[PDB]
């Protein structure tokens, strides 16, 4: 009944039925290919309670995508340092991006969402009016033709892949309207169940709350679809302890004023209410 | 537990729990957003048995994608007419492409799979060496780095959307290797459960058979993920008839020689063995 039970049941499934599968680093995982969960967004927000999620992170990252930034420093400046390693001098240099300034992640989410198909130069270039503004397109469609079955925002851009500091885990999302309610489905190609997935659910849930607010709809479901769902072998023992915790009721997300456009949202517009995660995993 | 039961349980779910949702066509639907089924490809091929699926069409269509064609006439010449209406004068005209030659679907699957990001001109243009050959990239990666979590072919191209005769229902697919087995997940954004979906499952299961053959792996699973899964209101009675039929075991798919490149497959190289479906059920197209 509690929606977090689906996440825990996925983790239980990978622990019990997953296959050992080597991976790009070399730490090894247990893996299952193809999973799906549905998190209701109706009068609650799916911010996992069996372990704390970095909400400040979720929110600032999402605001950073929306402004179309591809500078890790513009995020880091908000106290959210999750993308900093990927834009470091040594990391960029290792990919052959010696000409880039530190921070320049290349044409990642912000760019694809706002400027798909534009020619990326650097993180400081002016791309005003260039490419497809997928995010505004989705919002426009939801308002004018909510029954449309093509309401997609796609970060996966095969042309641009070699220029990105890393390829996106969240390949595309799709939006859906029925009965005054906005749903979102994420196709996530690769999910670290222990460390990444709870954050990723909160992210796409928050986007859906944001879009539903500006289009005058209510949040429906967040449908989480995974490709390689995995648990790193060093996360097994912590997840078994986590798996013994009963979820606390999900918190509520409140939007504190009437916001007209997606660009106008600010950190202060949001309040998480009644979040009571169980107390205290390496990447 | 017969794999076709998942498809039938999806249809039953939509019939029972779907919402009525108007659509672009005006016929209306019952719809659910977000579904997933897994079809084993291990010593069986998921060609549905509760009605007859147009296998010839599945095979010719996929071959046609593979060679990069965006010319409906080139598929029609094989006796497979499923794209002809999309390339017709009247339809191209309605979309505003009156300068376009009849048959010219614009930058659809074949172009995206073989030339992603190239500048489309017309269906007769020479695109050799232009854009990203995603199909070949996926094959290459499967061979050189089977654990890669980025093995994706994406037909959804927001830049090209406005030039396409129709936007792709199959937005992307991802491949996955473990234990000597090749799996594929399709993200299908919109599924006509009556007419489209059984054909679509066969398409991607066949694609997976083809790639596993080329990369020397065994087919694993086909995971079918749907966005707007819908039943047109006029398919309801035909599907209620179908839901009464008990599935028969799935057929086997045989590949009849060693093929070394995906471009070298021909219709003659495939044999469906033991396909014993219940009769065709006819359903009016939206
Ligand atoms: O769960 C994840 N969520 C992300 N959100 O931005 C990013 C990454 N991941 C995980 C999935 C894999 O563990 C790893 C990415 O490695 P890849 O799948 O090899 O590209 O990080
Ligand atoms: O199920 C489908 N499979 C296709 N495979 O190529 C193509 C189309 N369809 C269905 C889904 C919708 O009923 C219709 C396309 O309409 P749209 O989702 O409104 O773009 O055809």
């Amino acid at each position: 009944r509690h929606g977090e039970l689906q996440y825990l049941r996925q983790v239980e499934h990978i622990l019990r039925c997953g296959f050992k599968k080597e991976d790009r680093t070399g730490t090894g995982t247990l893996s299952v290919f193809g999973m799906q969960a549905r998190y209701s967004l109706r009068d609650e927000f799916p911010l996992l309670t069996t372990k704390r999620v970095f909400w400040k992170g979720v929110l600032e990252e999402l605001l950073w995508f929306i402004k179309g930034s591809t500078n890790a420093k513009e995020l880091s400046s908000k106290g959210v340092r999750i993308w900093d390693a990927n834009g470091s001098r040594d990391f960029l240099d290792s990919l052959g991006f010696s000409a880039r300034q530190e921070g320049d992640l290349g044409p990642v989410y912000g760019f694809q969402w706002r400027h798909f198909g534009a020619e990326y130069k650097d993180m400081d270039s002016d791309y005003s009016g260039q490419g497809v503004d997928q995010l505004q397109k989705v919002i426009d469609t939801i308002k004018t033709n909510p029954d449309d079955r093509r309401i997609i925002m796609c970060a996966w851009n095969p042309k641009d892949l070699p220029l990105m500091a890393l390829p996106p885990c969240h390949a595309l999302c799709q939006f859906y309207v029925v009965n005054g309610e906005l749903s979102c489905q994420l196709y996530q190609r690769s999910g670290d169940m222990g460390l990444g997935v709870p954050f990723n659910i909160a992210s796409y849930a928050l986007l859906t709350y944001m879009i539903a607010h500006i289009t005058g709809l209510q949040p429906g479901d967040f449908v989480h679809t995974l490709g390689d769902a995995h648990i790193y072998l060093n996360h097994i023992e912590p997840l078994k302890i986590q798996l013994q915790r009963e979820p606390r009721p999900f918190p509520k997300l409140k939007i504190l004023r009437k916001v007209e456009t997606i660009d106008d949202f600010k950190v202060e517009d949001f309040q998480i209410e009644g979040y009571n995660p169980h107390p205290t995993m390496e990447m």
Side-chain angles (χ1 to χ4, degrees), chain A:
Chain A
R1 205 142 232 297
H2 195 294
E4 191 164 353
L5 295 173
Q6 293 170 99
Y7 168 76
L8 292 175
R9 286 204 202 103
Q10 296 183 326
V11 169
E12 174 191 274
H13 182 73
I14 289 166
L15 285 177
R16 189 215 310 120
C17 301
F19 283 93
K20 197 269 175 152
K21 190 182 172 254
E22 295 274 293
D23 87 309
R24 172 185 53 81
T25 138
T27 136
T29 70
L30 297 180
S31 174
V32 165
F33 181 65
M35 307 188 98
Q36 185 173 89
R38 178 188 303 273
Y39 303 93
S40 176
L41 306 175
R42 298 184 188 79
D43 313 306
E44 52 178 21
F45 190 89
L47 191 63
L48 301 197
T49 68
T50 56
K51 181 188 183 263
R52 191 174 277 283
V53 181
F54 185 30
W55 175 249
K56 174 192 169 72
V58 176
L59 180 53
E60 290 289 7
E61 186 196 54
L62 188 54
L63 290 173
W64 171 78
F65 294 157
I66 287 163
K67 69 193 172 175
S69 186
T70 62
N71 192 344
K73 290 183 171 190
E74 171 77 36
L75 188 59
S76 190
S77 77
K78 310 298 179 183
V80 169
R81 304 188 169 83
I82 64 186
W83 285 86
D84 293 356
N86 291 321
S88 76
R89 189 64 278 151
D90 290 354
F91 188 80
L92 290 173
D93 280 343
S94 80
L95 299 169
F97 297 131
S98 59
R100 284 192 186 165
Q101 302 293 346
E102 180 167 60
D104 193 334
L105 299 160
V108 300
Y109 293 108
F111 185 85
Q112 300 303 333
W113 284 10
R114 292 305 206 162
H115 305 293
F116 194 105
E119 224 70 33
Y120 194 74
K121 297 151 92 105
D122 61 60
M123 72 186 165
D124 296 323
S125 318
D126 196 330
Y127 303 111
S128 270
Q130 300 176 43
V132 181
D133 184 344
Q134 300 185 82
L135 181 52
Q136 194 57 50
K137 199 150 287 269
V138 153
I139 286 151
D140 291 346
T141 302
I142 284 159
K143 281 186 189 170
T144 74
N145 189 11
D147 301 321
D148 184 90
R149 283 185 299 223
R150 304 109 167 246
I151 309 169
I152 293 170
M153 182 161 70
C154 184
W156 197 267
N157 183 338
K159 186 169 154 56
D160 285 351
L161 288 179
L163 300 177
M164 301 182 190
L166 67 187
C169 290
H170 305 120
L172 63 71
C173 61
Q174 181 175 7
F175 295 89
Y176 174 94
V177 186
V178 78
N179 191 29
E181 282 178 350
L182 178 69
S183 296
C184 177
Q185 180 161 189
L186 169 61
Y187 185 83
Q188 172 167 0
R189 69 165 175 77
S190 180
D192 178 342
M193 301 296 289
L195 283 182
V197 166
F199 185 110
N200 300 150
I201 291 165
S203 184
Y204 279 79
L206 165 65
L207 176 66
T208 300
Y209 262 74
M210 292 173 178
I211 297 181
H213 175 98
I214 62 173
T215 57
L217 296 173
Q218 295 302 303
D221 287 310
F222 173 55
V223 179
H224 187 215
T225 289
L226 287 154
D228 183 340
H230 55 265
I231 285 168
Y232 284 98
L233 299 169
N234 64 329
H235 295 171
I236 297 169
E237 231 48 58
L239 288 165
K240 282 155 71 209
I241 283 152
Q242 189 178 336
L243 279 161
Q244 290 185 134
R245 311 167 164 186
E246 283 178 337
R248 277 87 181 260
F250 276 146
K252 270 54 162 144
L253 174 73
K254 309 302 168 108
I255 299 176
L256 293 178
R257 68 172 174 109
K258 208 82 222 159
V259 177
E260 294 294 333
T261 74
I262 187 82
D263 313 277
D264 185 53
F265 287 107
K266 287 151 195 95
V267 66
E268 321 90 60
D269 297 326
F270 305 90
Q271 169 182 287
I272 284 285
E273 284 203 333
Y275 184 46
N276 296 305
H278 287 273
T280 306
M281 286 206 303
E282 80 158 302
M283 83 211 178

